[PDB]
Symmetry: D2
Subunit: 421 residues, 4 copies
């Protein structure tokens, strides 16, 4: 119903505060189930995926308490139904993150098996085999992953991920924290959300070492004592606002972030002709009104260029000077945004997993449709440098991946407004 | 929005009547814009894409005279607004078919540039380039393809398609019908709907030779007179009901159709172990209660295996004996239905354009979700064999590509029912 | 140990005669095995693959009249051995073309199963299956395809090609020419050499209709009598010399050719900036000293852009102005020539089946290596516009696909010389 | 003209063999001797043609090595004359590009022939150049040579980020940074074991390399690197090949002088195939107990994921396994030459893009085949052990480049293989 009308031309200039990592808050909220008492999770971003995670906890019997804005107190001792119903899992496949801790703490779980997702192929085979490696008897029946740990809880084991998985590493890490004995995860996801999740379990009395590297070692404990924690900054949001400034040729000082969690993104911004300055908890980018130069990029697991920034750089190459090759290795058909940009005058040829972008002088305003919680931000970025008005429909997707995108751009001098239907 | 509830286990047996081709009716209806008098189009299918095309004519000032048993009289001389609004084109990209004949008959047209489509990469550069080859000056602005022909009208020319395009051939074919001089379409699409359009334009007075081969030659004319013309049978609908019998191990006679327009589909049904007989206007498949045998297939332009039948054969391979390799060369990442079938207990490994389907003995009923007008029929087909109830949501997609799917399956003895919201 | 030493910088200018189609001569020669009397093939190109095909006839016991250069007389009635040995088949996989006619004419054959080729995936499964569909029992043993036709010869049948195959269509076409009754080749290869093969078999008394279209209906005959037929002109050779003049900015009049067998290639040369003029059997190209413009291309089955010209246009894009996207669909990783051009200063990024060629002002001479009988001609072309000398090694590959390439370039004024050792 | 291999299948393997030094570690370690200014001794070198080729490259530069003791080659780069890696040797081995980094950092300049094409797939070297340019070295590709020239005062350290994981790419910049003034930080670096072994070799010569093994390597430059005796690590690819050799035949084998931690992905896939495996400080013991292997799915990727050098070997395993398995290549998407040679031996393998859908059969049939890949062609030797009758493999000069006398080791396990010079 809600829409965003954006008038291009405006040069961005200002500073905004970054929200907590969406992909760190979800696994940490799921990790609260491992605790044996009330746990307060701070620096949460005000976006819909956090709200869907709160509903899920409601459906299970847990009643979250908001002591302050961007903060939730979770008490897992009031849990009644060990079920992640399909009515909610169908809306957010990240709900599967509850499977691991729920099985390792309470002994069983019935999580709905995720269906299809527009982005591409996103099976959860590794999530299931990882829990089986720890003795759990799992079966897919009636659309649910009916898991049940063996008597005496889960057992520690050496499990190898054939493919690097972020949420896969997270489920098995959480389960390994309460399993009996030592668990060793091989070819683990090295994303900072994983590290931030480990630091949460360790704060609670967990024995996790290796997070950040390909080999995570977990020494099981019988019970994780409650302890408060503040979620890390969102590396994707941070990057998205740096590109917003870059695309428009203006400047921005992104605050409350971390420069060490997006080296690849900052390095691509320098190749495009941007000047970057950084502090301990802030980043400052300034193009000085220069038309960027096309850059090539290849998505891959962290610390490589993240796929959640792939779309954002296509909107940069769209008005750049020269040809840029934006390649996908994670999700090879994540280019819906490209076909919407065609309407705005962007010249891009997509062949398989590669998007060849030919930079034109400027874009043209046209009504577009959002369809990806992170990639559709590129439509918001392209609209900022498009002659005329750009009406972006189906923004509920954008609301899932970004905290008040309209308000943050308005502080940077952007001419953008929300239009409720 | 409505839903479809299906109880599997029943072995289908009966006979139905095939409707008019959706992909033939769409260009044939668009082709009525070329007429210089009232034209009647028969055997139209009762599905939503046709309803959207009628609305498109409504926007342009034409008020199609619908009648009982699906017949539409169109007098294009009452046209008023030479525009195909984005509000209608965003719901169906096949609306671009009006560009060609509208530029050739009236000298100008403003048709919204199609946006993104979940299926995959579907650009329209060849549509635009083909009209540019005939002297028309085109420019993309405000999200619209603003086409203008010269004073004398469109001039015939030799145009070569770099990629085989069904709707591309149709647009350029229709434009060349009123153009001055001969036009030769090289590397043209050979689909039977292209031939059916050619024969429709010939009934109106046109002179189109070669339709159905790699080269189409058009000797342009001044005007096109009235004509009454029934469209061809739908080959995808025909193939879909043949699989419905094959998955359930039953029989089905398909009336009012044509066996010559789907030799590839019938051949893959022989490999699966199906007994097939054909007549002048009918096809009869009968599995004799046998479990299907796995089959490997590869989608390609007609007469190769059609991409619109790719999903239906995955349903067939899901309960087949052995492993089957289902490959896509047209829409490489068109496998959303595979992840929905995972919920029903199917075992399919998807890697890029290949779907390795490992057949199991039985599927399990569970709530699924449709997303593709033709491919989502596979979910209905998988539900016919699965154990228990299968609740299919978002059936408006199915209602676009198939004429009352529940009423036809009901004649074959299937437990299927429409449940409104 | 032969090598070509080219000195770049010369602007080509002249005219040359095109040889007979190499890929038409091979199957037409193989078709002579079907005959029941002396058959003479004319207009043969003097290249190694024809020599290798003649050695095979020698090993089979046939003593062909090799008096004349451009023609050969063959009497299959004097055959002594129904075998295509591994010693020869390993050097040329096109040797499999003798399988079909040998099985149909002599009731059995044992042809070595081709091994790997550095180009890409080239299995011969459609060849084996097509013969099996005609009632022939076939097994693979000792690295040989041992086929055996039933008593009364092969039976005609409807056979569907899952993938468009040139040599596949040619084998089943030849076998069906002597089979009992009608045969229907569904989704046949439309390449001009298949048409040239059909007309040859028809000249011997056969009845092959639909050659050049997607469906070929062959009515088998009992005996194929003598005929004196001249093969068609080589379309790939034509295109290579047209590019030779296009890269050097010169001109060239190609004689004894046909413009209708390479419309896709002629169209891409116009998009590059070359002025083309044609006739019944000639094609004249002239760049008039202009630097070409970058062009995109997609290889596919004829009449689409041929894969045997994909490398030739990569050298053209190297010297071109702008970025050119060269895409492969037949052999998705046939880019060895690209990595050889990096040595000559060419800026080409390769990702899967797509080559992003970024044009530069000039190439630098350096010793390179040939690996493909058709694509390595691009190394010879790049050397024409490279500064200094370019020493090409392993030219035996080029001698297979081109009739004394240096002598024809000498006619056009190119500084090219052959030096053994 | 050249050697061949004749293999008679059916024999169940049983025995033990000693693993040689890592080819891909011995190659960069030898090139790293150029950084030193003294008599550096390198032990445990494998006897394979590529080590001989690297020695020839040193000879053309004026550095003839002296063998101190068995398998211990002592190199002293102070006697170097010419700073050029000729095309005549680089065209035969593209790994020769590894001398560029150290030759530029120590001596100031270098001319290394730009490698051409490799049948395996797309293997450009743009990151090797981009990394040296990030350290101030001006480079140009003229006459087919990478004419690199460092600025006065040596190379300057820099924070270079690899857009794609490159093993040899990570090694060249690591060696260059070893002597470059200032700190160098390689981001998204290759995590392969040979990178770690190389880092420990440079540290043994007085270097300062941290984070080798992890995706972030920090290097601190020094004035010079003194002499030190060092032994190269075991070859993980050789280890895996012989573990499959025992597995395809339903037999067993103990692998000595190796390391299980350097091929976890390989050992897990063998357990999924139904192989009983035991490990220790420096050995691996596998035994199929005569059971037919189970079909397994694979996905090649940068270490520690399943290595692409082991992809071909597991196809020969699936070729005779129970069920259908998918072998996927993310690195070299068209590295399947061996598959078409396996078809000749009776294997059922459908290739589409980078996926090899292997459907297993009771057994293979012997047939003459041809090798064309220094590592992947070992699969032809493996599939020949389970092929009825004789199998004549040709162009084995490729196999000699990546394996130390493959016939004498299979003969130690009881395999009916023999080398035929005819
Ligand atoms: C799109 C989002 O961000 C995504 C982000 O794009 C991806 C990749 O960086 O990693 C997270 O997803 P994820 O954990 O489901 O994805 P991953 O598991 O890393 O998948 C990577 C690759 O591994 C494959 N994969 C994954 C899991 C599995 O069991 N098997 C498997 O084969 C997938 O096919 C995919 O191609 C983020 N989501 C969360 C909740 O952490 C989002 O916020 O929803
Ligand atoms: C999905 C539908 O059916 C589809 C059917 O799947 C396909 C393939 O057979 O051909 C029709 O689409 P279409 O005309 O857009 O498809 P094609 O034009 O043949 O596209 C084939 C390929 O060519 C490429 N392509 C197409 C047009 C173009 O200008 N440029 C281009 O590069 C596309 O990327 C695609 O990969 C049907 N639609 C209609 C209205 O005729 C539907 O009912 O909407
Ligand atoms: C390389 C040469 O030219 C080639 C030329 O590149 C191609 C494409 O037009 O068609 C001929 O090969 P071919 O007939 O072996 O190749 P095709 O059969 O067309 O193969 C096309 C595609 O179909 C697939 N294919 C073909 C046959 C088969 O049984 N199975 C199969 O999967 C292949 O994987 C390939 O990707 C020419 N050769 C001859 C002797 O006619 C040469 O000079 O030998
Ligand atoms: C085949 C051999 O082993 C190979 C082994 O297969 C590969 C992969 O693990 O890593 C080494 O090659 P390499 O270092 O040249 O390969 P990598 O640099 O890792 O290349 C991996 C991928 O990165 C890409 N790549 C690499 C470098 C570069 O500058 N740009 C680039 O795009 C390539 O296209 C390739 O697809 C081994 N060789 C040596 C001497 O260390 C051999 O012994 O020759
Ligand atoms: C993808 C984004 O999955 P999700 O919505 O997060 O469950 C989708 O549905 O498109
Ligand atoms: C695809 C299915 O195209 P269309 O609806 O026909 O415009 C989509 O939009 O998802
Ligand atoms: C390719 C070109 O196949 P062929 O020689 O024609 O059998 C090769 O072997 O390199
Ligand atoms: C590959 C293997 O590279 P190299 O020979 O090692 O330079 C090849 O040439 O095929
Ligand atoms: Cl697609
Ligand atoms: Cl590991
Ligand atoms: Mg969703
Ligand atoms: Mg739609
Ligand atoms: Mg060859
Ligand atoms: Mg080589």
């Amino acid at each position: 119903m809600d829409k965003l009308i954006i008038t291009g031309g405006a040069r961005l200039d200002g500073e905004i505060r970054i929200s907590g990592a969406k992909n760190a808050a979800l696994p940490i909220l799921a990790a609260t189930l491992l605790a044996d008492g009330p746990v307060t999770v701070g620096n949460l971003p005000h976006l819909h995926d956090i709200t869907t995670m709160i509903e899920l906890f409601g459906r299970m019997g847990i009643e979250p308490v908001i002591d302050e804005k961007l903060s939730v107190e979770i008490d897992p001792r009031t849990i009644k139904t060990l079920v992640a119903p399909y009515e909610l899992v169908k809306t957010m496949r990240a709900s599967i993150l509850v499977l691991g801790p729920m099985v390792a703490r309470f002994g069983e779980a019935e999580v709905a098996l995720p269906g299809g997702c527009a982005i591409g192929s996103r099976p959860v085979d590794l999530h299931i085999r990882g829990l089986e490696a720890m003795g759990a008897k799992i079966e897919v029946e009636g659309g649910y992953i009916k898991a049940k740990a063996p008597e005496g809880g889960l057992r520690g084991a050496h499990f190898f991920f054939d493919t690097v998985s972020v949420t896969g590493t997270e489920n098995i890490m959480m389960a390994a924290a309460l399993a009996k004995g030592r668990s060793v995860l091989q070819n683990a996801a090295r994303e900072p959300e994983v590290v931030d999740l480990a630091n949460f379990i360790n704060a609670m009395g967990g024995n996790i070492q290796g997070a950040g590297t390909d080999t995570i070692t977990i020494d099981g404990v019988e019970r994780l004592d409650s302890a408060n924690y503040r979620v890390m900054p969102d590396r994707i949001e941070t990057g998205t606002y740096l590109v917003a400034a870059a695309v428009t040729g203006g400047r921005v000082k992104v605050k409350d972030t971390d420069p060490t969690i997006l080296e690849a993104v900052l390095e691509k911004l320098k190749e495009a002709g941007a000047d970057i300055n950084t502090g301990e908890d802030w980043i400052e980018l300034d193009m000085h009104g220069k038309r960027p130069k096309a850059v090539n990029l290849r998505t891959a697991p962290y610390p490589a260029f993240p796929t959640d920034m792939q779309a954002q750089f296509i909107s940069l190459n769209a008005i750049a000077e020269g040809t840029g090759a934006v390649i996908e290795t994670i999700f090879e058909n994540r280019f819906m945004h490209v076909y919407e940009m065609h309407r705005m005058g962007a010249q891009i040829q997509v062949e398989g997993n590669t998007a060849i972008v030919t930079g034109v002088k400027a874009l043209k305003g046209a009504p577009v449709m959002a369809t990806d919680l992170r990639a559709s931000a590129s439509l918001v970025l392209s609209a900022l440098v498009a002659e005329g008005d750009t009406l972006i429909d189906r923004i509920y997707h954008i609301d899932r991946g970004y905290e008040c995108i309209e308000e943050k751009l308005q502080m940077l001098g952007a001419k953008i407004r929300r239009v409720p239907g």
